[PDB]
Structures are given as C-alpha cells and as structure tokens.
C-alpha cells in the first residue's frame, strides 16, 4: 500500500542498527544518514535505528542484517513501514537483564565489562523488551530489555541509568516470542479473516469510519466449523494480532460447585473486560454452553444460559466489547444466541481447497526442509485434499520416516547425536511419498477398514469397463476446467449387474486401491439399527461425512439387499426401510454440492432394485457383468497365473476354449484345486523323504522339495475332472431378462442426416 513499507533486503554490514538505504531511498523518503527513524514489524514490533546511505547496497529495498531481522521478528524482503522516531529521549531507569541461554559461559559482569561502550553515550533507542546479542567474553551475550522508565524506544546513553539485576532470561521465553501466530496453517479463509479484521482493525484503526457510518459493528461474532483444525489456531492468531485485552474464556470454566458461581464468574469476567480495555470476549469452545434452553433440563444450566443471554443480549451491554465466539457444532447452537442481538455475526469455517491446501501446507512446512528436490505444491495437488491438521499429520509422518531412515543409519544416540549428521539428516521426496502412502483422512479413519491391495491392471478382463471407470474418476478431477468449459456435470450412480463376487467385489476393491481419491465402502447390513430412527440417522450422518469428505467414493456394496422396492413382498413391515430409502434419495437428490459423489452399485439380482434410486440422476449406469469369453477366460487365467509358477506343458488356450461356460470364480477355484493337489504332493514327497532319512542317512538339500514348482499338468487335469461351471441356465435367463429390459429400453443410433 503505502510507499513507506519498503522491502527489507539483506545488509552486507553486520551492524544491527544500520540499514543500507539507496540514494533514491534516502532521498524520496525523509531518510538522512543520521535519522533515527522507527520501523514497525510483525505483532507490534517497533524499533528505532539508523538509516545508512548506501546507494550501491540497496535498490528500492532496505538492506537489513540478519540480526535486525531476528530482533524485529521479520523475514527478508518484508515491506516494513518506516517512520521518524525523534521522541526517543534518554531513559531514566531502564531495567535490563541478560539471557540465560545467551549469558551461559560468559563469567563475571559480562554486561558492564563486555558491552560497556555499547550503551554509554551510544544513543541506543531500542524498545523496552528487546534482546540483542552482544559479543562479550569470547561469546555472544544477549541481554533482554527488562523495562524502561521512559517509553519503549528510549535512547540508552551514558546519562541513562540502566537498571540491571542478576536475572538470566531462559530460552523458553525466547521460543514463546518466536512462537508467533499468523497465517501458517490457514489457507483460503480470506473472507473470514477480512471480516474479522474489519470487525477489529477497521473498528479500531478506523473507529471514525464507524462513527460516520452511524452504526456499530457486530460485537457478537460466531465461528462455526470443525474446531482445532486451525480454529484454535485462528483464535491464537487473533490474540497475537489483537492489541486489546483478549478475555479468553474456556468452556467448562465458570461452572463451579458453589451456588451461582458460574454466573458470578461470567459477570466478573464481563466487567473486568469492560473496565480493562475495548476488549474482545475470546469465548473459546463456546459450542457446548447451552442447548437453546429447550433441552436444558438442568436448572443450573438454565440459569447459566439466562445469565449468558442477559450479558450478551442486554441493553448497553457491549460497548467496544467484541465477542469472539467459536462453534464446533453449529447445530448445537442455542436459539437466542444464533439470532442477532445475542450474536449479531456468525461465520462457518470450511475445509480448504487443494490450492489453499498447498498454501497452508507450504506455510506449515516453512519451518523445515524435508525435500530439497521436491515441491510440496506438487504433492499437495497430488494430495486428495485431507484438510485441517491433515497437513501437520503428513509433515509429522514424513519427519518420522526421515527419523527412521536417519537413526537407522545412526546409533541410539542417547547423548552423542552427530550434529553434522543431525544437520539436515534427511530431506527426501521419498519420505513424503511414504508418509502420504501411510497417510489417510483422519475423519474417515473411524470408518476406515483394512482392504486387500489390488491394481486396476492386476484385474483381468472388462478392459473397456475398467478404462471407462478410470476415466470417469480422473476427468471429474483431472479436467475440472474442461468440464467447466463444456458446462456439464458428471455421473454418480454407477451400478453392476451380474453374478457378484466372481471378481465383482474384487473389481470394486481393485478400483478403490487404484483410486486416487477416498472410498467409503458400505455393507448391506451395516447401517441397520433397532432404536427409533437410529438407522436413518446413521445413514444421514454417513452421507454428511462423505459430502464433507470430498473427494470420496460411495462403495455401496451389496446394494441389492438395501435397494428393495417398497412392497416387494406381500406387505411391508416396520416401515423404517422406506424411511431409509427416502433418506437415501434425500442424499441421492436435493440441491447441494455433491463434489465427489462416486456411488458404486453392486447387485446380483437387478429385480430387487427399487426403481426410484435406480432412476436416472439417482442412478447413472449399470454394468451388465456377463461371464468371461474364451478371450476373457484367458485374460483371467493369466491374471491368476501372475503369482503362480507357470508350466510350459499347460495348454491355457485349450482350457479357455474348453472353459467357455466357466466363471472367474470357477477359474480361481480350478487354480486353487491344482495348487492344493501340488501342495499335497509336495507334503507327501517331504514325508517320504523324511521317512527314508529317518531310517537311513540321506541328503536333505535337494530340489525334490519342489518336484514341480510349476503346475503339474496332471494337477490341472484332475482339477478339470473335479468340477465344472456353476452357471445356471435359469440364472442366465434372469440376467438376460434384465439385459433385454435394458435393451428394449434402448434403441438404434440417431445418425440423423
């Protein structure tokens, strides 16, 4: 904005209070070579120093040394505003104290005998509270400005009486000061941040603007959303930015055993904040404070709610008194509070987008370098979009993998950590990749289950169908811009018709494993419940979570048992099944985001399908999964033989032609039978060899252990003679009936010329 916020470049000079300023900088700004100006930093970091005139050492950028940046808590290139500081007079009695972590080793009076001329007639106008490292006693002793009788920026001179005690400042306070709060895990919440700042900064920095507006801003602002995902971080950032009193209020804080203790405490806190400053009511974890005074069976709870309403909703109650209200369950909100007057403003915190995800992830990762040759934005784009502290979890997992790699190459190092080895021990993209592979969305973790790993390539047959499914998954994500340009929405209700479990459920599992996005698998009997409406509530919660867990895949497995039409038997019983169907339609329909609704339909009996969800929109398509052709038979056979030892004497083509009517489950069964025969033969051979060795001295290291590591053609012939296809002509007829229904529902191509 203002030109006074010049970029904070790097100064070649090691002087802390000297900034190399360009001739244009020293000229356009009222910046002489000996002008004591004040520079404002982050989190109200104000200091006064000298402006050196170095045209060749600055190009419209304030060359600042690393000591200056550390003292001011600012980075390089920062647009720091500079204003004249001529009010810096000599301090009367300035309290000073060295830093324990910095004065450790410098024996004696390492302040008066080390930095003697550093403050005596040295014109040191430093803020009251700053710590500067001083080279004394072959060390760098940092003395923190304990206090100053004059104002913060006081010109420490020989006339200034620097009060000094033997208080050594521990490094814990140093870390806490370095533990500032800004936009490190918050990416994309620009609207909310702007609203808060306007409710605070514009309210403060432009109070006359509000006065001319003739209306006060909203004193009661609510912050809905998933808390602690940065919500607590949001409050911390506000408090760090806020200069007014932040009357932090915990949730289970005022409720005490004594009578009326909570209400008295609340009134006392309100009065203290009012008399303190134009404070903001940092009502932390305010969500569980009142059930709208309707379900409030607790008389103490009712009294607490009434007192809270009186304090908040009250005439001439909140004068320059903001109410930092944070909500984790917006539904749990009280009735009166949700209205303006009790909370005039209310905001909901949403999950971040992949761009905001990359921003927040990079900002969080700024503390370290865990991959020098990898871009965190590349992974974040590759990341599905797990949000909140998901980035923190990913960083921690990468750090754990790196530590595993390092301490694997290192010893226990209980006291002898090799610092050079410790110095950036690991910065690897592989660590990030392993973390991500070991990472998953924490919200769905309670619903997460272990599944076998299988590749879309690892499954043989239905190559066109697999390609179509993969394209449907990718294009919806990979080319969202292309969809926007075309201006069309994707399909959701993909079903599958045929004998399931022949690889059908296996196909779903392989897709989910090969799926870049999340996948939620639903069992048929999974959502049933006995309590009144409990099953419907569970279904609603699952749908809501999936909507929140974008992207995700609704693997509604065994949907045949859940998709029965309302009245498929002589009568309905209980009626809750119809309620569940209606709730599913409410999920299947209704105006909402449906960002990644990947509904997977699995049903062996299409006749057991309720047409309403089976209808278009509510259903996208059904995969009429037929039996494998001889080509598909050979494909499935090769896929099965992937881990098997192959015998050149096995005529796979001859079997596939013979096993025209067989099935993928049948092929797997034949393979298992041949394997069992081979295993039995091997066990018998081992027993015979041991018995011969039991009776006589015989060699043990022989290849007879695997007389046929590949498949014995005899084993294959025996498996063929064992069983045959389980395909039913009546089942074939039913499948063909469903297919003919679909086909008569279809028609010839337009080809309109």
């Amino acid at each position: 904005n203002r030109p006074n916020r010049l970029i904070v470049d790097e100064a070649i000079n090691e002087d802390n209070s000297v900034v190399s300023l360009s001739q244009p900088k020293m000229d356009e700004l009222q910046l002489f070579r000996g002008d004591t100006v004040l520079l404002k930093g982050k989190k109200r970091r104000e200091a006064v120093c000298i402006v050196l005139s170095d045209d060749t050492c600055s190009d419209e950028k304030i060359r600042m040394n690393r000591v200056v940046r550390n003292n001011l808590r600012v980075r390089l290139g920062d647009v720091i505003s500079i204003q004249p500081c001529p009010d810096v007079k000599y301090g009367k009695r300035i309290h000073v104290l060295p830093i324990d972590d910095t004065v450790e080793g410098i024996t004696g009076n390492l302040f008066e005998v080390y930095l003697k001329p550093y403050f005596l007639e040295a014109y040191r106008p430093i803020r009251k509270g700053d710590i500067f490292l001083v080279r004394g006693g072959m060390r760098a002793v940092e003395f923190k400005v304990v206090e100053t009788d004059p104002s913060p920026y006081c010109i420490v001179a020989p006339d200034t009486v620097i009060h000094c005690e033997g208080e050594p400042i521990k490094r814990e306070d140093e870390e806490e000061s370095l533990n500032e709060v800004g936009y490190d895990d918050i990416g994309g919440c620009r609207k909310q941040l702007a609203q808060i700042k306007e409710m605070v900064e514009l309210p403060l920095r432009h109070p006359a603007l509000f006065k001319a507006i003739g209306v006060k801003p909203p004193r009661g602002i609510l912050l809905y959303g998933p808390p602690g995902t940065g919500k607590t971080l949001i409050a911390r950032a506000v408090a760090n930015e806020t200069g007014a009193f932040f009357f932090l209020i915990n949730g289970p804080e005022i409720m005490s055993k004594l009578a009326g203790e909570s209400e008295s405490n609340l009134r006392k806190a309100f009065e203290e904040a009012e008399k303190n400053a134009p404070a903001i009511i940092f009502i932390d974890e305010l969500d569980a404070i009142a059930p709208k005074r309707e379900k409030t069976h607790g008389e103490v709870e009712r009294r607490i709610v009434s007192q809270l309403l009186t304090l908040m909703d009250g005439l001439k109650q909140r004068a320059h008194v903001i109410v930092m209200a944070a909500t984790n369950r917006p539904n749990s909100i009280d009735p009166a509070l949700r209205r303006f007057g009790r909370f005039d403003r209310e905001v909901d915190i949403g999950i971040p987008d992949a761009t905001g995800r990359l921003e927040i992830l990079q900002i969080h990762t700024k503390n370290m370098k865990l991959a020098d040759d990898v871009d965190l934005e590349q992974v974040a784009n590759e990341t599905h979009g797990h949000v909140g502290a998901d980035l923190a979890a990913l960083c921690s997992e990468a750090a754990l993998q790196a530590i595993r790699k390092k301490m694997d190459l290192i010893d226990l190092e209980d006291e002898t950590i090799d610092a050079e080895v410790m110095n950036s021990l690991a910065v690897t993209m592989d660590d990030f990749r392993w973390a991500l592979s070991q990472s998953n969305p924490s919200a769905l973790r309670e619903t997460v289950v272990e599944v076998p790993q299988v590749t879309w390539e690892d499954i043989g047959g239905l190559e066109d169908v697999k390609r179509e499914l993969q394209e449907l998954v990718q294009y919806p994500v990979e080319h969202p811009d292309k969809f926007l340009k075309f201006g069309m929405t994707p399909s959701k209700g993909v079903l599958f018709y045929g004998p399931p479990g022949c690889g059908k459920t296996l196909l779903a599992k392989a897709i989910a494993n090969e799926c870049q996005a999340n996948f939620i698998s639903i069992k048929g009997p999974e959502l049933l419940t006995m309590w009144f409406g409990e099953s419907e509530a569970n279904v609603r919660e699952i749908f809501d979570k999936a909507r929140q867990a974008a992207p995700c895949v609704l693997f509604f497995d065994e949907l045949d048992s859940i998709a029965k039409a309302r009245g498929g038997n002589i009568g309905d019983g209980g009626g809750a099944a119809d309620r569940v169907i209606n709730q599913i339609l409410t999920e299947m329909d209704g105006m909402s985001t449906k960002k990644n609704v990947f509904i997977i339909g699995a049903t062996n009996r299409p006749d057991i399908i309720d047409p309403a969800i089976l209808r278009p929109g509510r259903l996208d398509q059904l995969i009429y999964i037929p039996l494998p052709d001889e080509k598909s038979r050979v494909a499935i056979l090769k896929a099965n033989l992937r881990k098997s030892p192959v015998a050149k004497d096995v005529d796979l083509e001859f079997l596939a032609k013979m096993t025209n009517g067989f099935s993928g489950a049948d092929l797997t069964e034949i393979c298992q039978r041949a394997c069992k025969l081979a295993i039995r033969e091997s066990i018998e051979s081992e027993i015979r060899r041991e018995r011969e060795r039991q009776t006589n001295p015989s060699a043990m290291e022989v290849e007879e252990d695997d007389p046929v590591p590949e498949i014995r053609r005899d084993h294959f012939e025996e498996a063929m003679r064992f069983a045959r296809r389980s395909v039913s002509d009546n089942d074939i007829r039913k499948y063909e009936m469903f297919a003919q229904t679909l086909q008569q529902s279809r028609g010839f191509g337009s080809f309109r010329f």
Partner: peptide
C-alpha cells in the same frame, strides 16, 4: 530483577 536499585555499570 529490580530497577534503579543496583549500582549500575558506570562509564
């Protein structure tokens, strides 16, 4: 820690 109570480092 104290202010103006200890004899200071005179120059």
């Amino acid at each position: 820690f104290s202010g103006e109570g200890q004899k200071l480092g005179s120059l």
